[PDB]
Amino acid sequence: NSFSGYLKLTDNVYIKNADIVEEAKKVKPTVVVNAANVYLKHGGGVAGALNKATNNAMQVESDDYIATNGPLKVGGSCVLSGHNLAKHCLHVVGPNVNKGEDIQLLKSAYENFNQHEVLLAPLLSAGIFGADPIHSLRVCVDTVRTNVYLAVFDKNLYDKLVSSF
Ligand SMILES: Nc1ncnc2c1ncn2[C@@H]1O[C@H](COP(=O)(O)OP(=O)(O)OC[C@H]2O[C@@H](O)[C@H](O)[C@@H]2O)[C@@H](O)[C@H]1O
């Protein structure tokens, strides 16, 4: 967990303008967080970038998990292998606001972070799921008490997050 280049937002929340995949390769963290859907079908955001960097090992593992356990609940999580990127991957499902799911479930989603002392993580629901990224950062800051290192790839979004925080 050797995190460098992060801006301190609060006592336990840090942020960097970086690709979460490149951070995982540099830091080799204990836990990397995936912004997942309930079926762990890894799509066009963080999930697909993580999966591609595991040369699809993550998706094969995820498919087997889902065949046994069924879908996650919105706001829920599961711990699977981090493969070559981390010791563990915490797959967390934020609400899909674009499909009408309750934004209030973003609190429950971030509560999953508290089971791990330190995490490399993205802003949940703030991309393909359509939540306000500024709001997602606020919920993270208010909800997570363990040490979270947030990686935000889009510099325009990063600058707006830091400015309004
Ligand atoms: N490689 C990346 N590194 C860092 N941040 C990233 C990266 N790619 C996207 N982001 C940012 O991470 C945040 C989360 O975006 P998404 O990954 O799209 O996550 P979410 O909004 O929760 O959507 C989940 C959905 O997207 C699919 O990838 C996934 O399978 C699920 O269906 C957003 O702020 C987005 O700009």
Curated annotation (Swiss-Prot):
Activity regulation field: Inhibited in vitro by GRL-0617.
Membrane topology, record value: Multi-pass membrane protein
Macro domain boundaries: 1-165
Catalytic activity: Thiol-dependent hydrolysis of ester, thioester, amide, peptide and isopeptide bonds formed by the C-terminal Gly of ubiquitin (a 76-residue protein attached to proteins as an intracellular targeting signal)
Location relative to the cell: Host endoplasmic reticulum membrane
Quaternary assembly: May form homohexamers. Interacts with N protein.
Function comment: Responsible for the cleavages located at the N-terminus of the replicase polyprotein. Participates together with nsp4 in the assembly of virally-induced cytoplasmic double-membrane vesicles necessary for viral replication. Antagonizes innate immune induction of type I interferon by blocking the phosphorylation, dimerization and subsequent nuclear translocation of host IRF3. Also prevents host NF-kappa-B signaling. In addition, PL-PRO possesses a deubiquitinating/deISGylating activity and processes both 'Lys-48'- and 'Lys-63'-linked polyubiquitin chains from cellular substrates.
Protein name: Papain-like protease nsp3
Organism from which the protein derives: Severe acute respiratory syndrome coronavirus 2
